[PDB]
Amino acid sequence: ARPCIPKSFGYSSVVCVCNATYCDSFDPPTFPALGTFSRYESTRSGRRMELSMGPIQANHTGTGLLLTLQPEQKFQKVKGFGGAMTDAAALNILALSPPAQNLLLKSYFSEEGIGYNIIRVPMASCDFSIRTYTYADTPDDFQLHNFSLPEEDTKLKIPLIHRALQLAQRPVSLLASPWTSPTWLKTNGAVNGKGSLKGQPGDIYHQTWARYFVKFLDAYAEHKLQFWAVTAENEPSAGLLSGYPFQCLGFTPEHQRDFIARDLGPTLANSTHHNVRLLMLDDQRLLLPHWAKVVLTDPEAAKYVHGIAVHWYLDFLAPAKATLGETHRLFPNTMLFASEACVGSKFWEQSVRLGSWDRGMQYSHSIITNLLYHVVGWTDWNLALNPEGGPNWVRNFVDSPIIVDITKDTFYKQPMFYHLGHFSKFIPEGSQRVGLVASQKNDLDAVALMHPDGSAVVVVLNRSSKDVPLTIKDPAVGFLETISPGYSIHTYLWRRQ
Ligand SMILES: *[C@@H]1O[C@H](CO)[C@@H](O[C@@H]2O[C@H](CO)[C@@H](O[C@@H]3O[C@H](CO[C@H]4O[C@H](CO)[C@@H](O)[C@H](O)[C@@H]4O)[C@@H](O)[C@H](O)[C@@H]3O)[C@H](O)[C@H]2NC(C)=O)[C@H](O)[C@H]1NC(C)=O
Numbered sequence: 001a002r003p004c005i006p007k008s009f010g011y012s013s014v015v016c017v018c019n020a021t022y023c024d025s026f027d028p029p030t031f032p033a034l035g036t037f038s039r040y041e042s043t044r045s046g047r048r049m050e051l052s053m054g055p056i057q058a059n060h061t062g063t064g065l066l067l068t069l070q071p072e073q074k075f076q077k078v079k080g081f082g083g084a085m086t087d088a089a090a091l092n093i094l095a096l097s098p099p100a101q102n103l104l105l106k107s108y109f110s111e112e113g114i115g116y117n118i119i120r121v122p123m124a125s126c127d128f129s130i131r132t133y134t135y136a137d138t139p140d141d142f143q144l145h146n147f148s149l150p151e152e153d154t155k156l157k158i159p160l161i162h163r164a165l166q167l168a169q170r171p172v173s174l175l176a177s178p179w180t181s182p183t184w185l186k187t188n189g190a191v192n193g194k195g196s197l198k199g200q201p202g203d204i205y206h207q208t209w210a211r212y213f214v215k216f217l218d219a220y221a222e223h224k225l226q227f228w229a230v231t232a233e234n235e236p237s238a239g240l241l242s243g244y245p246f247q248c249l250g251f252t253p254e255h256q257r258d259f260i261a262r263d264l265g266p267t268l269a270n271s272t273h274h275n276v277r278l279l280m281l282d283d284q285r286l287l288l289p290h291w292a293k294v295v296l297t298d299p300e301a302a303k304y305v306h307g308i309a310v311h312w313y314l315d316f317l318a319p320a321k322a323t324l325g326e327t328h329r330l331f332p333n334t335m336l337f338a339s340e341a342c343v344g345s346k347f348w349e350q351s352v353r354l355g356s357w358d359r360g361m362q363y364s365h366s367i368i369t370n371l372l373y374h375v376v377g378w379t380d381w382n383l384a385l386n387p388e389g390g391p392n393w394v395r396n397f398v399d400s401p402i403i404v405d406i407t408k409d410t411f412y413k414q415p416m417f418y419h420l421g422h423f424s425k426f427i428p429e430g431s432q433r434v435g436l437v438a439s440q441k442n443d444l445d446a447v448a449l450m451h452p453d454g455s456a457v458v459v460v461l462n463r464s465s466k467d468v469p470l471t472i473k474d475p476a477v478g479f480l481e482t483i484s485p486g487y488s489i490h491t492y493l494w495r496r497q
C-alpha cells in the first residue's frame with residue numbers, strides 16, 4: 001500500500017526508511033482468481049515485494065528451465081517464522097517515539113507487514129542485555145523463594161510482546177530459551193566461561209534448575225503470556241569452551257539426555273505447563289545427528305522431547321543432507337526447527353552493513369535450504385538493533401533486519417526483512433512443503449508449499465547475476481511463464497481449483 005522510501009549507505013542495495021509518520025506497508029495477502037497467478041518481486045535494484053499478475057496457460061513448449069510442482073508429494077507442516085525479543089531489541093524499539101514503535105511492530109506482526117507468528121524470549125540475561133542477571137541471584141536459594149522477574153521482563157519485554165499479539169491476526173507462538181543459570185548452581189560460579197550445573201542430573205542442583213523453568217512459566221502466565229515451547233538450554237556446547245565470553249551453561253549430549261529424562265521432563269510434565277513443548281539441542285547443526293542419537297535413543301528422555309532446535313552459525317561447514325537429512329531419516333517423528341540466525345557474528349563479518357543484498361540472500365537461501373530438509377520453522381535473532389549492532393554487554397555486535405537510528409526517530413528495514421517476508425507473509429502455520437523438481441541444472445533456489453486451503457506458494461531466489469527465464473508447471477492447472485532476474489527473490493501464489 002505505501003512504497004519503500006529508499007536510502008543507500010553505499011552497500012549493494014537500499015534500506016526502506018520509516019519514522020513516526022511514514023513506513024512502507026503491504027496489503028494483506030490474497031490468492032488471485034483461478035486461472036491467474038500473483039508474483040511478488042524484490043530486487044537488488046530496489047523493488048520491494050512489487051505485485052504483478054499473469055495468466056496460467058494450458059500448454060507450454062520450449063527448451064527453457066521447467067519447475068514441476070509435485071502437489072501430492074507431501075513433506076513437513078510449517079510451524080512459522082519470527083524473531084527474538086531480547087533486552088537489546090526491546091530497548092531499541094522503546095527508544096523510538098510511540099508512533100514509530102507502532103510502525104516497527106506493525107512491520108513485523110500485522111498483515112500490512114510480514115505476519116510473524118513466533119517470538120523467542122530469553123529467560124533472563126544474554127549477550128544482548130546491558131545488565132547480567134538471572135531470575136534467582138540470591139545465593140543458595142534452592143527453594144527459589146527469591147525467584148522474580150525484573151523490569152527487563154515486566155516493563156520492557158512483556159508489554160512489547162502484548163502489543164505484538166494485539167497487532168497479530170495469526171496465533172503467535174512464544175519460545176523460551178535460557179543462556180545461564182544462577183551462578184550458585186554452576187561449577188565455575190560465573191555467568192560465562194567453561195561451567196556446567198554442579199553435581200549430576202537427578203540431584204538438588206538439577207531439580208532446582210528444572211523448577212526454575214516452571215517458576216519462569218508461572219511468572220509469565222501471571223502476566224497473561226503462555227509459551228508454545230521451551231529449549232533445554234541455548235547453545236549448550238558453548239559452556240564446554242574454555243573462556244566462553246558471555247552467558248552459557250555447558251552440557252555434553254549425555255548431560256542433556258539425563259537432565260531431560262530425570263529433571264526437566266518430569267518437572268514440566270507434573271506442572272500446569274505440561275502442554276508446553278520441549279526442544280533439545282538449540283545449537284549448531286554440525287552437532288547432528290550425534291546429539292539426536294544420544295538423547296532420543298534413551299526412551300526416558302525421548303518421551304519428553306517434541307523437537308530439535310538448530311542454529312545456523314556452522315551451516316557453511318555442515319552440509320544439510322548429512323545433518324538435517326540424516327536426523328530426519330533416523331527420527332522422522334521429531335520435528336526440526338531453526339531457532340536462531342543472524343549475520344555479523346563471525347570474525348570476517350562486519351556487525352552492520354546497511355542495505356546489504358548479500359545478507360538478504362543469506363536469509364532466503366537458509367530458509368529455502370532448511371525447508372528442503374524438513375525444518376518446520378525459522379527464527380531470526382534480535383528483532384531490532386542500533387547502527388553499531390547493539391547494545392550488547394560484551395560488544396558482540398551483529399546485524400538485524402531492522403536498524404533503529406534514535407537521533408532521527410527513524411528505523412531502516414533492510415533486505416533481510418524483505419527476504420524473510422517472502423516466506424512469513426505467504427506461508428501460514430499448517431502449510432505443507434510439497435515437491436518441486438527442475439528439468440535441468442540451474443542456479444536458482446526454490447521451494448513449493450501447499451497453503452492450508454490447497455493453493456500453491458512457490459519461492460524462487462536467484463543468487464546469480466544472470467536473468468533466468470523459467471516456466472512453473474502445475475499439472476492440474478497449467479503453466480506460469482515467468483523470468484527470475486539476477487539477484488531477485490519471487491513469491492508466486494495461485495489457486496488450484
Ligand atoms: C518521515 O518520513 C517521510 C518520508 O521520507 C518524510 O517526508 C519526506 O520529507 C522530504 C523532505 O521534506 C520530502 O522530500 C522533498 O520531496 C520533494 C519531492 O516529493 C515527492 O517525491 C518523493 C520521492 O519520489 C515522494 O516520496 C513524495 O511523496 C513526493 O511526491 C522534493 O521536491 C524536495 O526537494 C525534497 O526531496 C518528501 O517529499 C517527504 N516524503 C513523503 C512521502 O512525505 C518526513 O519528513 C519524515 N518525518 C520526519 C519527522 O522526519
Ligand SMILES: *[C@@H]1O[C@H](CO)[C@@H](O)[C@H](O)[C@H]1NC(C)=O
Nearest residue numbers: 056057058059060061478479
Ligand atoms: C494445447 O494442446 C492440445 C493438444 O495438442 C491442443 O489440441 C489444444 O488446442 C492446445 N491448447 C489448449 C488446450 O488451450
Ligand SMILES: *[C@@H]1O[C@H](CO)[C@@H](O)[C@H](O)[C@H]1NC(C)=O
Nearest residue numbers: 137138139141144145146147
Ligand atoms: C527471600 O525471600 C524470603 C521469603 O519470602 C524473604 O524472607 C527474604 O528476605 C528474601 N531475601 C532477599 C535477599 O530478598
Ligand SMILES: *[C@H]1C=C[C@@H](O)[C@H](O)[C@H]1O
Nearest residue numbers: 126127234235340345396
Ligand atoms: C546466537 C548467536 C549470537 C549470540 O548473540 C547469541 O547469544 C547466540 O545464542
Ligand code: NA
Nearest residue numbers: 344345346349
Ligand atoms: Na563480526
